[PDB]
Amino acid sequence: MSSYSIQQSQKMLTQLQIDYATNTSSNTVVAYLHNVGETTISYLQNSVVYFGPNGQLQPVGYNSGSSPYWTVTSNSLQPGSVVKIIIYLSSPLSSNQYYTIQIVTPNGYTVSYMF
Amino acid sequence: MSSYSIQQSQKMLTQLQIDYATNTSSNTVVAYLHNVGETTISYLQNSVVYFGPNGQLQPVGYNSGSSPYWTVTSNSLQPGSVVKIIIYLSSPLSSNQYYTIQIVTPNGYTVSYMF
Amino acid sequence: NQAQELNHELELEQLETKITVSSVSLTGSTLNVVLENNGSTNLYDFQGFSVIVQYYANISNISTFNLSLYNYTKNSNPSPYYWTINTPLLAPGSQATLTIILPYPPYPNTQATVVIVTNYGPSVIWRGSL
Amino acid sequence: NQAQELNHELELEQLETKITVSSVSLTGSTLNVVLENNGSTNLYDFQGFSVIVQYYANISNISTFNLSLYNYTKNSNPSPYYWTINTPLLAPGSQATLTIILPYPPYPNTQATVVIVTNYGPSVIWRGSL
């Protein structure tokens, strides 16, 4: 009598992924966004970014200069490249909670990382 | 010193998946294709299907009437619906090799199932 | 953007959805699976679920491979190839009983695989003996 | 079709790729990861890889959190913030040594996370003490 959730038989093509994400201080978060496809992804400033404790993600504004906001090391992402997203937070993260960052490119492509 | 391949912190949106796939005989393969996204997927007859032992997949022709060919129960797939893919094989499957079926809809969305 | 916000919501619900099998029990051709919601999403769109069962049917005393997909019904006395569930919405932490009407009684003490897929994508596979 | 064939192949290469860390060894600022190819693809596009290291740096005898991305170089004696590997192509079943040049020696007996991503997507994470 063996039960398990989802399948490692069941897979789909990945064209974009967050290789790693974590907080670097009490109020800054770093994510490495990796294009493993064959297409350039442009206008990443028009991505939508959400971040928060699990189940309570909040929107994050692009490069507004005032927390919470996010920056990216390049506005476009070529095949095989990585760019670095940073989130500047207004309130400090708690040491005993798990957080999710999620990024939605203009093309709708949706990736997440939990730490 | 602890090491792990991939990570269950890194995830992406699934819009389409093979819920389950297996052989129903030595020469016939069934897959259940589930649209868990939000848009209808049309013209599934123009999908491309590949199937074979792991690492040796061969293309499979749509509805040719002579092995190897595949059929689908409906030419489009609405949000939340399932269709049934059948592959008729020319030579029998082996009880030791693992097999993979892969489906690429016209929109390019690429899913696979291994058994 | 709207497709962006749709995909945002959907992926969060896939991350938040999880189900497990507490137990499985057979009576005749009727398969009762106790399912528990270990996620943080409500589950109620059962017409978007999948239920697939691979098992060994007793056909004139011959153990015969069967693989079928079962369709959901609100009908409390479902026909063969149909399934239903004794709750209108399965909330986090709750359990319900999912009833699957097999076309033939299982051959005794044969292996079986039951696949249950939520409408969001996440699923559970149960393997055991019937 | 064009995207259909590109996506078909790419997804097969993702399914076929897998790497593990056989071991880790440190000398000064030099991090040697013995990496094994447990897949069925050859791996050779090491510039399309990612290497991320989170560790605790010894900066003037202060243990200081560090998170960095490391750049590939064919150079056998790499600079800080670079990495390299002692093979030009890693075939299935083989192992090779991936060398990461940390900007500071690790603070003694601190925990660390090493993320190594193949160019196709699949990756391995190692967590341990330095």
GROMACS .gro file of C-alpha atoms in nm:
model
  490
    1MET     CA    1   0.000   0.000   0.000
    2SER     CA    2   0.224   0.285  -0.132
    3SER     CA    3   0.104   0.642  -0.197
    4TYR     CA    4   0.310   0.938  -0.322
    5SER     CA    5   0.231   1.282  -0.463
    6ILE     CA    6   0.302   1.405  -0.823
    7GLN     CA    7   0.530   1.201  -1.056
    8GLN     CA    8   0.895   1.191  -1.161
    9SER     CA    9   0.758   1.019  -1.472
   10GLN     CA   10   0.571   1.337  -1.556
   11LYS     CA   11   0.781   1.623  -1.690
   12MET     CA   12   0.759   1.924  -1.918
   13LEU     CA   13   1.000   2.141  -2.111
   14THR     CA   14   1.178   2.408  -1.906
   15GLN     CA   15   1.278   2.724  -2.089
   16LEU     CA   16   1.334   2.947  -1.785
   17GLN     CA   17   1.417   2.877  -1.422
   18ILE     CA   18   1.537   3.034  -1.099
   19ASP     CA   19   1.864   2.849  -1.034
   20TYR     CA   20   1.879   2.967  -0.675
   21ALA     CA   21   1.725   3.229  -0.451
   22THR     CA   22   1.784   3.331  -0.091
   23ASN     CA   23   1.793   3.632   0.137
   24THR     CA   24   2.130   3.803   0.166
   25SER     CA   25   2.036   4.018   0.465
   26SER     CA   26   1.729   4.085   0.673
   27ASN     CA   27   1.570   4.292   0.397
   28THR     CA   28   1.732   4.200   0.060
   29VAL     CA   29   1.660   3.893  -0.152
   30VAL     CA   30   1.868   3.763  -0.443
   31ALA     CA   31   1.744   3.536  -0.723
   32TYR     CA   32   1.939   3.397  -1.021
   33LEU     CA   33   1.715   3.377  -1.329
   34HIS     CA   34   1.841   3.137  -1.596
   35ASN     CA   35   1.723   3.112  -1.959
   36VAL     CA   36   1.771   2.748  -2.067
   37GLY     CA   37   1.570   2.795  -2.389
   38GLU     CA   38   1.663   2.907  -2.738
   39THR     CA   39   1.477   3.240  -2.745
   40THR     CA   40   1.570   3.582  -2.617
   41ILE     CA   41   1.341   3.714  -2.343
   42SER     CA   42   1.307   4.092  -2.367
   43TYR     CA   43   1.164   4.379  -2.161
   44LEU     CA   44   1.217   4.212  -1.827
   45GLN     CA   45   1.129   4.543  -1.661
   46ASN     CA   46   0.773   4.452  -1.760
   47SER     CA   47   0.791   4.131  -1.563
   48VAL     CA   48   0.565   4.104  -1.263
   49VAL     CA   49   0.740   3.999  -0.943
   50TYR     CA   50   0.569   3.866  -0.630
   51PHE     CA   51   0.735   3.785  -0.300
   52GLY     CA   52   0.633   3.702   0.049
   53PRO     CA   53   0.590   3.437   0.312
   54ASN     CA   54   0.434   3.120   0.175
   55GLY     CA   55   0.074   3.185   0.079
   56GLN     CA   56   0.096   3.562   0.126
   57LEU     CA   57   0.300   3.681  -0.169
   58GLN     CA   58   0.276   4.059  -0.241
   59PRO     CA   59   0.351   4.241  -0.566
   60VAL     CA   60   0.688   4.416  -0.598
   61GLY     CA   61   0.745   4.729  -0.807
   62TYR     CA   62   1.022   4.763  -1.062
   63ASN     CA   63   1.313   4.984  -0.963
   64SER     CA   64   1.092   5.239  -0.786
   65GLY     CA   65   1.371   5.345  -0.550
   66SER     CA   66   1.151   5.284  -0.245
   67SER     CA   67   1.099   4.947  -0.073
   68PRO     CA   68   0.958   4.707  -0.163
   69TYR     CA   69   1.109   4.719  -0.510
   70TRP     CA   70   1.317   4.501  -0.740
   71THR     CA   71   1.604   4.541  -0.985
   72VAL     CA   72   1.748   4.321  -1.258
   73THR     CA   73   2.103   4.327  -1.395
   74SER     CA   74   1.975   4.345  -1.755
   75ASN     CA   75   1.646   4.426  -1.927
   76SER     CA   76   1.690   4.129  -2.160
   77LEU     CA   77   1.799   3.767  -2.123
   78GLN     CA   78   1.965   3.572  -2.400
   79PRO     CA   79   1.964   3.192  -2.439
   80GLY     CA   80   2.187   3.027  -2.182
   81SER     CA   81   2.239   3.347  -1.982
   82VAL     CA   82   2.166   3.432  -1.618
   83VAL     CA   83   2.054   3.766  -1.477
   84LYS     CA   84   2.033   3.862  -1.111
   85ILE     CA   85   1.714   3.999  -0.954
   86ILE     CA   86   1.736   4.177  -0.619
   87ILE     CA   87   1.437   4.261  -0.399
   88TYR     CA   88   1.467   4.540  -0.143
   89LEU     CA   89   1.223   4.479   0.141
   90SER     CA   90   1.065   4.723   0.383
   91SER     CA   91   1.028   4.489   0.673
   92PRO     CA   92   1.281   4.232   0.791
   93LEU     CA   93   1.237   3.867   0.714
   94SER     CA   94   1.167   3.629   0.998
   95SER     CA   95   1.418   3.356   1.069
   96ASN     CA   96   1.147   3.092   1.111
   97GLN     CA   97   0.931   3.135   0.803
   98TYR     CA   98   0.960   3.018   0.440
   99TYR     CA   99   0.942   3.263   0.153
  100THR     CA  100   0.853   3.234  -0.214
  101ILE     CA  101   0.960   3.462  -0.495
  102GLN     CA  102   0.774   3.436  -0.823
  103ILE     CA  103   0.849   3.599  -1.157
  104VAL     CA  104   0.616   3.632  -1.455
  105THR     CA  105   0.781   3.750  -1.774
  106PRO     CA  106   0.583   3.965  -2.020
  107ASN     CA  107   0.525   3.647  -2.227
  108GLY     CA  108   0.348   3.503  -1.920
  109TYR     CA  109   0.623   3.251  -1.841
  110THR     CA  110   0.592   3.183  -1.467
  111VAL     CA  111   0.867   3.058  -1.236
  112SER     CA  112   0.909   3.043  -0.860
  113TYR     CA  113   1.165   2.962  -0.593
  114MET     CA  114   1.107   2.881  -0.228
  115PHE     CA  115   1.356   2.917   0.058
  116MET     CA  116   2.787   1.675   0.362
  117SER     CA  117   2.443   1.638   0.190
  118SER     CA  118   2.383   1.643  -0.191
  119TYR     CA  119   2.058   1.632  -0.399
  120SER     CA  120   1.986   1.653  -0.777
  121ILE     CA  121   1.747   1.934  -0.887
  122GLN     CA  122   1.541   2.082  -0.594
  123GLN     CA  123   1.171   2.086  -0.501
  124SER     CA  124   1.204   2.460  -0.424
  125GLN     CA  125   1.229   2.539  -0.797
  126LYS     CA  126   0.899   2.521  -0.980
  127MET     CA  127   0.716   2.663  -1.279
  128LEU     CA  128   0.361   2.692  -1.405
  129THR     CA  129   0.218   2.371  -1.553
  130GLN     CA  130  -0.045   2.426  -1.819
  131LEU     CA  131  -0.050   2.077  -1.967
  132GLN     CA  132   0.045   1.734  -1.843
  133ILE     CA  133   0.028   1.363  -1.907
  134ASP     CA  134  -0.156   1.240  -1.601
  135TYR     CA  135  -0.059   0.878  -1.664
  136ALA     CA  136   0.077   0.667  -1.946
  137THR     CA  137   0.144   0.296  -1.981
  138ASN     CA  138   0.126   0.011  -2.228
  139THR     CA  139  -0.202  -0.174  -2.237
  140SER     CA  140  -0.047  -0.463  -2.435
  141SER     CA  141   0.281  -0.547  -2.605
  142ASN     CA  142   0.196  -0.327  -2.903
  143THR     CA  143  -0.036  -0.056  -2.773
  144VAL     CA  144   0.038   0.247  -2.553
  145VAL     CA  145  -0.216   0.477  -2.384
  146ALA     CA  146  -0.157   0.828  -2.246
  147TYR     CA  147  -0.400   1.063  -2.068
  148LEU     CA  148  -0.337   1.426  -2.167
  149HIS     CA  149  -0.475   1.681  -1.923
  150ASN     CA  150  -0.516   2.054  -1.989
  151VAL     CA  151  -0.466   2.212  -1.648
  152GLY     CA  152  -0.409   2.558  -1.801
  153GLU     CA  153  -0.674   2.814  -1.887
  154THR     CA  154  -0.698   2.819  -2.265
  155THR     CA  155  -0.840   2.568  -2.507
  156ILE     CA  156  -0.572   2.391  -2.710
  157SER     CA  157  -0.685   2.332  -3.066
  158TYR     CA  158  -0.569   2.121  -3.361
  159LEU     CA  159  -0.417   1.841  -3.158
  160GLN     CA  160  -0.402   1.639  -3.479
  161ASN     CA  161  -0.110   1.869  -3.570
  162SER     CA  162   0.074   1.778  -3.254
  163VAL     CA  163   0.396   1.586  -3.290
  164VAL     CA  164   0.426   1.263  -3.094
  165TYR     CA  165   0.748   1.076  -3.022
  166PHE     CA  166   0.775   0.742  -2.849
  167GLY     CA  167   1.042   0.489  -2.779
  168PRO     CA  168   1.276   0.328  -2.529
  169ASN     CA  169   1.458   0.583  -2.317
  170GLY     CA  170   1.701   0.768  -2.538
  171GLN     CA  171   1.576   0.618  -2.866
  172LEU     CA  172   1.244   0.789  -2.928
  173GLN     CA  173   1.104   0.773  -3.279
  174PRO     CA  174   0.848   1.007  -3.432
  175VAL     CA  175   0.497   0.864  -3.464
  176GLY     CA  176   0.258   0.955  -3.744
  177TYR     CA  177  -0.096   1.075  -3.687
  178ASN     CA  178  -0.373   0.828  -3.764
  179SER     CA  179  -0.196   0.648  -4.051
  180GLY     CA  180  -0.379   0.317  -4.002
  181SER     CA  181  -0.050   0.124  -4.010
  182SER     CA  182   0.196   0.091  -3.721
  183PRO     CA  183   0.352   0.297  -3.578
  184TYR     CA  184   0.070   0.552  -3.554
  185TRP     CA  185  -0.127   0.741  -3.289
  186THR     CA  186  -0.483   0.862  -3.243
  187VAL     CA  187  -0.649   1.118  -3.017
  188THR     CA  188  -1.011   1.118  -2.897
  189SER     CA  189  -1.070   1.484  -2.979
  190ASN     CA  190  -0.905   1.748  -3.191
  191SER     CA  191  -0.907   2.011  -2.913
  192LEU     CA  192  -0.864   2.020  -2.534
  193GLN     CA  193  -1.050   2.268  -2.311
  194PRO     CA  194  -0.936   2.389  -1.969
  195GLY     CA  195  -0.963   2.102  -1.724
  196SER     CA  196  -1.036   1.834  -1.986
  197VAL     CA  197  -0.857   1.506  -2.063
  198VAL     CA  198  -0.803   1.329  -2.395
  199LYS     CA  199  -0.678   0.976  -2.460
  200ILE     CA  200  -0.377   0.920  -2.685
  201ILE     CA  201  -0.322   0.574  -2.829
  202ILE     CA  202  -0.003   0.455  -2.999
  203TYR     CA  203  -0.014   0.142  -3.212
  204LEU     CA  204   0.333  -0.010  -3.232
  205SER     CA  205   0.492  -0.232  -3.495
  206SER     CA  206   0.716  -0.429  -3.260
  207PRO     CA  207   0.642  -0.544  -2.905
  208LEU     CA  208   0.769  -0.366  -2.595
  209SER     CA  209   1.027  -0.522  -2.363
  210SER     CA  210   0.967  -0.581  -1.991
  211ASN     CA  211   1.305  -0.436  -1.897
  212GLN     CA  212   1.355  -0.117  -2.100
  213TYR     CA  213   1.190   0.203  -1.987
  214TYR     CA  214   0.986   0.392  -2.240
  215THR     CA  215   0.905   0.759  -2.287
  216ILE     CA  216   0.618   0.917  -2.475
  217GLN     CA  217   0.647   1.284  -2.558
  218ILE     CA  218   0.386   1.518  -2.703
  219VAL     CA  219   0.440   1.861  -2.857
  220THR     CA  220   0.122   2.054  -2.923
  221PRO     CA  221   0.115   2.293  -3.221
  222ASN     CA  222   0.169   2.580  -2.975
  223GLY     CA  223   0.500   2.404  -2.891
  224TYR     CA  224   0.404   2.303  -2.537
  225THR     CA  225   0.609   1.990  -2.472
  226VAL     CA  226   0.521   1.723  -2.216
  227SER     CA  227   0.647   1.373  -2.155
  228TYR     CA  228   0.567   1.066  -1.950
  229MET     CA  229   0.799   0.779  -1.867
  230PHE     CA  230   0.710   0.423  -1.764
  231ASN     CA  231  -0.112   4.243  -1.778
  232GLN     CA  232  -0.391   3.987  -1.758
  233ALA     CA  233  -0.223   3.670  -1.881
  234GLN     CA  234   0.059   3.756  -1.637
  235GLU     CA  235  -0.181   3.785  -1.347
  236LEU     CA  236  -0.367   3.465  -1.445
  237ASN     CA  237  -0.045   3.264  -1.463
  238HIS     CA  238   0.069   3.417  -1.132
  239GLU     CA  239  -0.249   3.304  -0.957
  240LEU     CA  240  -0.254   2.961  -1.121
  241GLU     CA  241   0.105   2.874  -1.035
  242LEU     CA  242   0.052   2.979  -0.676
  243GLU     CA  243  -0.244   2.743  -0.657
  244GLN     CA  244  -0.044   2.457  -0.804
  245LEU     CA  245   0.226   2.519  -0.541
  246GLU     CA  246  -0.041   2.530  -0.269
  247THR     CA  247  -0.229   2.211  -0.374
  248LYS     CA  248  -0.151   1.869  -0.229
  249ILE     CA  249  -0.352   1.550  -0.174
  250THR     CA  250  -0.271   1.210  -0.023
  251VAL     CA  251  -0.444   0.872   0.015
  252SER     CA  252  -0.524   0.777   0.372
  253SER     CA  253  -0.663   0.433   0.283
  254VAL     CA  254  -0.826   0.222   0.011
  255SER     CA  255  -1.104  -0.033   0.056
  256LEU     CA  256  -1.293  -0.260  -0.186
  257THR     CA  257  -1.643  -0.405  -0.183
  258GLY     CA  258  -1.741  -0.588  -0.499
  259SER     CA  259  -1.672  -0.352  -0.787
  260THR     CA  260  -1.683  -0.045  -0.561
  261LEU     CA  261  -1.353   0.115  -0.469
  262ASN     CA  262  -1.359   0.362  -0.181
  263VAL     CA  263  -1.047   0.579  -0.149
  264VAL     CA  264  -1.011   0.807   0.154
  265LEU     CA  265  -0.841   1.122   0.031
  266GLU     CA  266  -0.700   1.398   0.249
  267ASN     CA  267  -0.623   1.758   0.150
  268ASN     CA  268  -0.273   1.838   0.275
  269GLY     CA  269  -0.257   2.169   0.093
  270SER     CA  270  -0.385   2.518   0.152
  271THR     CA  271  -0.629   2.531  -0.142
  272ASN     CA  272  -0.996   2.438  -0.139
  273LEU     CA  273  -1.081   2.153  -0.375
  274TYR     CA  274  -1.427   2.148  -0.532
  275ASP     CA  275  -1.390   2.156  -0.913
  276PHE     CA  276  -1.418   1.779  -0.938
  277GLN     CA  277  -1.522   1.795  -1.301
  278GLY     CA  278  -1.158   1.905  -1.361
  279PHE     CA  279  -1.006   1.619  -1.165
  280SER     CA  280  -0.884   1.299  -1.325
  281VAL     CA  281  -0.934   0.949  -1.190
  282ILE     CA  282  -0.751   0.672  -1.371
  283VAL     CA  283  -0.743   0.315  -1.246
  284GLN     CA  284  -0.523   0.032  -1.374
  285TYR     CA  285  -0.621  -0.294  -1.212
  286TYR     CA  286  -0.682  -0.662  -1.280
  287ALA     CA  287  -1.043  -0.751  -1.349
  288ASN     CA  288  -1.197  -1.089  -1.275
  289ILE     CA  289  -1.354  -1.184  -1.609
  290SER     CA  290  -1.491  -1.540  -1.607
  291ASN     CA  291  -1.220  -1.629  -1.354
  292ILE     CA  292  -0.946  -1.483  -1.575
  293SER     CA  293  -0.735  -1.204  -1.427
  294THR     CA  294  -0.745  -0.944  -1.702
  295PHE     CA  295  -0.557  -0.614  -1.717
  296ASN     CA  296  -0.790  -0.314  -1.726
  297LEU     CA  297  -0.697   0.053  -1.764
  298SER     CA  298  -0.974   0.310  -1.764
  299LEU     CA  299  -1.047   0.674  -1.696
  300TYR     CA  300  -1.345   0.747  -1.471
  301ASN     CA  301  -1.569   1.052  -1.508
  302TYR     CA  302  -1.700   1.248  -1.212
  303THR     CA  303  -2.072   1.258  -1.135
  304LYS     CA  304  -2.282   1.436  -0.875
  305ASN     CA  305  -2.507   1.132  -0.891
  306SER     CA  306  -2.489   0.951  -0.560
  307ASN     CA  307  -2.536   0.605  -0.719
  308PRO     CA  308  -2.284   0.621  -1.004
  309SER     CA  309  -2.264   0.390  -1.302
  310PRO     CA  310  -1.954   0.193  -1.403
  311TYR     CA  311  -1.666   0.411  -1.524
  312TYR     CA  312  -1.788   0.692  -1.297
  313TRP     CA  313  -1.675   0.824  -0.962
  314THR     CA  314  -1.813   1.060  -0.701
  315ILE     CA  315  -1.714   1.204  -0.363
  316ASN     CA  316  -1.912   1.249  -0.041
  317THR     CA  317  -1.836   1.622   0.004
  318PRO     CA  318  -1.902   1.930  -0.210
  319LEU     CA  319  -1.570   2.090  -0.124
  320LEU     CA  320  -1.262   1.936   0.036
  321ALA     CA  321  -1.103   2.192   0.261
  322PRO     CA  322  -0.742   2.184   0.382
  323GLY     CA  323  -0.696   1.925   0.655
  324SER     CA  324  -1.025   1.752   0.574
  325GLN     CA  325  -1.081   1.407   0.429
  326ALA     CA  326  -1.346   1.268   0.201
  327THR     CA  327  -1.436   0.935   0.047
  328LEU     CA  328  -1.401   0.905  -0.328
  329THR     CA  329  -1.614   0.622  -0.471
  330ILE     CA  330  -1.508   0.458  -0.798
  331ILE     CA  331  -1.737   0.213  -0.978
  332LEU     CA  332  -1.518  -0.045  -1.151
  333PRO     CA  333  -1.662  -0.230  -1.454
  334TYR     CA  334  -1.563  -0.572  -1.304
  335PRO     CA  335  -1.470  -0.692  -0.956
  336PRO     CA  336  -1.092  -0.701  -0.906
  337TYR     CA  337  -0.930  -1.038  -0.930
  338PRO     CA  338  -0.837  -1.123  -0.569
  339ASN     CA  339  -0.498  -1.010  -0.438
  340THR     CA  340  -0.382  -0.846  -0.759
  341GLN     CA  341  -0.186  -0.526  -0.791
  342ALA     CA  342  -0.356  -0.200  -0.881
  343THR     CA  343  -0.262   0.162  -0.946
  344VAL     CA  344  -0.502   0.448  -0.869
  345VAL     CA  345  -0.415   0.795  -1.004
  346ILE     CA  346  -0.605   1.095  -0.868
  347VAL     CA  347  -0.536   1.437  -1.023
  348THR     CA  348  -0.665   1.767  -0.892
  349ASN     CA  349  -0.795   2.027  -1.135
  350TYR     CA  350  -0.479   2.232  -1.069
  351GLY     CA  351  -0.235   1.962  -1.175
  352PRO     CA  352  -0.095   1.815  -0.855
  353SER     CA  353  -0.186   1.450  -0.810
  354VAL     CA  354  -0.129   1.135  -0.607
  355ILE     CA  355  -0.058   0.778  -0.718
  356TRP     CA  356  -0.151   0.484  -0.497
  357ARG     CA  357  -0.016   0.136  -0.564
  358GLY     CA  358  -0.129  -0.171  -0.376
  359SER     CA  359  -0.322  -0.497  -0.372
  360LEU     CA  360  -0.691  -0.549  -0.434
  361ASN     CA  361   0.740   2.247  -3.748
  362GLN     CA  362   1.030   2.455  -3.611
  363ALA     CA  363   0.945   2.519  -3.245
  364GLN     CA  364   0.800   2.169  -3.224
  365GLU     CA  365   1.129   2.012  -3.320
  366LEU     CA  366   1.343   2.245  -3.108
  367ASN     CA  367   1.126   2.185  -2.802
  368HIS     CA  368   1.115   1.809  -2.867
  369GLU     CA  369   1.493   1.783  -2.862
  370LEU     CA  370   1.551   2.027  -2.577
  371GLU     CA  371   1.307   1.846  -2.351
  372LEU     CA  372   1.469   1.513  -2.433
  373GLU     CA  373   1.805   1.653  -2.335
  374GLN     CA  374   1.658   1.779  -2.009
  375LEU     CA  375   1.505   1.438  -1.935
  376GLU     CA  376   1.835   1.270  -2.021
  377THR     CA  377   2.061   1.494  -1.805
  378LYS     CA  378   2.160   1.426  -1.443
  379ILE     CA  379   2.468   1.511  -1.236
  380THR     CA  380   2.571   1.436  -0.881
  381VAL     CA  381   2.843   1.553  -0.647
  382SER     CA  382   3.067   1.263  -0.554
  383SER     CA  383   3.279   1.466  -0.316
  384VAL     CA  384   3.400   1.809  -0.202
  385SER     CA  385   3.746   1.915  -0.087
  386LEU     CA  386   3.882   2.254   0.014
  387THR     CA  387   4.234   2.396   0.006
  388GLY     CA  388   4.272   2.763   0.091
  389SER     CA  389   4.025   2.947  -0.133
  390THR     CA  390   4.004   2.651  -0.373
  391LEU     CA  391   3.692   2.437  -0.380
  392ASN     CA  392   3.717   2.105  -0.562
  393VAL     CA  393   3.389   1.931  -0.637
  394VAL     CA  394   3.413   1.581  -0.781
  395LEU     CA  395   3.109   1.570  -1.008
  396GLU     CA  396   2.974   1.258  -1.173
  397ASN     CA  397   2.762   1.238  -1.489
  398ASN     CA  398   2.481   0.993  -1.411
  399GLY     CA  399   2.282   1.077  -1.724
  400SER     CA  400   2.280   0.967  -2.087
  401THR     CA  401   2.390   1.299  -2.240
  402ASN     CA  402   2.740   1.428  -2.291
  403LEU     CA  403   2.811   1.751  -2.105
  404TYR     CA  404   3.049   2.000  -2.264
  405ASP     CA  405   2.883   2.344  -2.286
  406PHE     CA  406   3.035   2.448  -1.955
  407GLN     CA  407   2.982   2.817  -2.035
  408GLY     CA  408   2.608   2.755  -2.030
  409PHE     CA  409   2.634   2.610  -1.681
  410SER     CA  410   2.571   2.810  -1.366
  411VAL     CA  411   2.780   2.789  -1.050
  412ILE     CA  412   2.648   2.959  -0.739
  413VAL     CA  413   2.815   2.935  -0.399
  414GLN     CA  414   2.672   3.048  -0.066
  415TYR     CA  415   2.928   3.012   0.210
  416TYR     CA  416   3.080   3.196   0.506
  417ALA     CA  417   3.392   3.386   0.408
  418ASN     CA  418   3.682   3.459   0.641
  419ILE     CA  419   3.715   3.833   0.591
  420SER     CA  420   3.975   3.966   0.835
  421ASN     CA  421   3.888   3.683   1.076
  422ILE     CA  422   3.518   3.770   1.064
  423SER     CA  423   3.277   3.504   0.939
  424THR     CA  424   3.090   3.691   0.666
  425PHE     CA  425   2.797   3.559   0.461
  426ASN     CA  426   2.877   3.542   0.091
  427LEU     CA  427   2.657   3.462  -0.208
  428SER     CA  428   2.820   3.473  -0.549
  429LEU     CA  429   2.784   3.358  -0.908
  430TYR     CA  430   3.102   3.217  -1.061
  431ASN     CA  431   3.211   3.251  -1.425
  432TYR     CA  432   3.353   2.968  -1.633
  433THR     CA  433   3.703   2.986  -1.779
  434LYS     CA  434   3.904   2.727  -1.971
  435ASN     CA  435   4.205   2.866  -1.784
  436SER     CA  436   4.349   2.589  -1.565
  437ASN     CA  437   4.461   2.840  -1.299
  438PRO     CA  438   4.146   3.054  -1.262
  439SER     CA  439   4.104   3.392  -1.096
  440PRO     CA  440   3.872   3.462  -0.799
  441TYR     CA  441   3.502   3.443  -0.888
  442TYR     CA  442   3.581   3.195  -1.168
  443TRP     CA  443   3.552   2.822  -1.202
  444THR     CA  444   3.686   2.557  -1.437
  445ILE     CA  445   3.685   2.181  -1.486
  446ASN     CA  446   3.956   1.921  -1.556
  447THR     CA  447   3.786   1.769  -1.865
  448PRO     CA  448   3.668   1.908  -2.200
  449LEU     CA  449   3.364   1.681  -2.214
  450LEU     CA  450   3.204   1.475  -1.939
  451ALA     CA  451   3.055   1.154  -2.075
  452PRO     CA  452   2.795   0.939  -1.894
  453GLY     CA  453   2.949   0.744  -1.608
  454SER     CA  454   3.259   0.962  -1.594
  455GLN     CA  455   3.365   1.196  -1.316
  456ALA     CA  456   3.558   1.521  -1.330
  457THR     CA  457   3.677   1.780  -1.081
  458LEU     CA  458   3.514   2.120  -1.090
  459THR     CA  459   3.731   2.388  -0.933
  460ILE     CA  460   3.580   2.705  -0.784
  461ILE     CA  461   3.806   2.988  -0.672
  462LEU     CA  462   3.640   3.146  -0.371
  463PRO     CA  463   3.724   3.512  -0.303
  464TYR     CA  464   3.815   3.428   0.060
  465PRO     CA  465   3.900   3.106   0.241
  466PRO     CA  466   3.592   2.967   0.414
  467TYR     CA  467   3.563   3.044   0.781
  468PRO     CA  468   3.649   2.714   0.950
  469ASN     CA  469   3.363   2.470   1.000
  470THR     CA  470   3.086   2.686   0.853
  471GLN     CA  471   2.799   2.557   0.646
  472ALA     CA  472   2.775   2.615   0.271
  473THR     CA  473   2.552   2.551  -0.030
  474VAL     CA  474   2.689   2.488  -0.380
  475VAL     CA  475   2.455   2.500  -0.679
  476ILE     CA  476   2.574   2.355  -1.011
  477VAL     CA  477   2.336   2.383  -1.308
  478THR     CA  478   2.391   2.215  -1.641
  479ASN     CA  479   2.329   2.421  -1.953
  480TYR     CA  480   2.011   2.218  -2.028
  481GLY     CA  481   1.847   2.302  -1.696
  482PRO     CA  482   1.898   2.006  -1.460
  483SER     CA  483   2.119   2.076  -1.160
  484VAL     CA  484   2.259   1.951  -0.830
  485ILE     CA  485   2.282   2.123  -0.490
  486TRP     CA  486   2.539   2.025  -0.229
  487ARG     CA  487   2.500   2.135   0.134
  488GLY     CA  488   2.770   2.073   0.391
  489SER     CA  489   3.049   2.213   0.607
  490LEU     CA  490   3.373   2.377   0.503
   0.00000   0.00000   0.00000
